[PDB]
Amino acid sequence: TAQKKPRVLWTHELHNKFLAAVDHLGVERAVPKKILDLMNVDKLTRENVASHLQKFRVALKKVS
Known part of the structure; x- marks a missing residue:
């Protein structure tokens, strides 16, 4: 009993x-x-997690 999304x-x-x-x-x-x-997880690589990380610092620079 639980959700069932393919490749989260x-x-x-x-x-x-x-x-x-x-x-x-x-x-x-x-x-x-x-x-x-x-x-x-399948379909998850290191470049996918390294992108969201480098995207946060950018979201941390200009924050209004």
């Missing part, structure tokens, strides 16, 4: 694992390559 791309679920995986490694030294194993 970015849902509240895949977001909870990427959050506890970065925190578990310290967002300061947490890399997307090692966390890529934390996800262990």
Whole structure:
């Protein structure tokens, strides 16, 4: 009994694992390559998690 989405791309679920995986490694030294194993999801590569990370810093620069 539970949802049934094929290959989760970015849902509240895949977001909870990427959050506890970065925190578990310290967002300061947490890399997307090692966390890529934390996800262990199909269709998920290290360049996909490294893009959302570099996109946040950009969203952190100009914030009004």
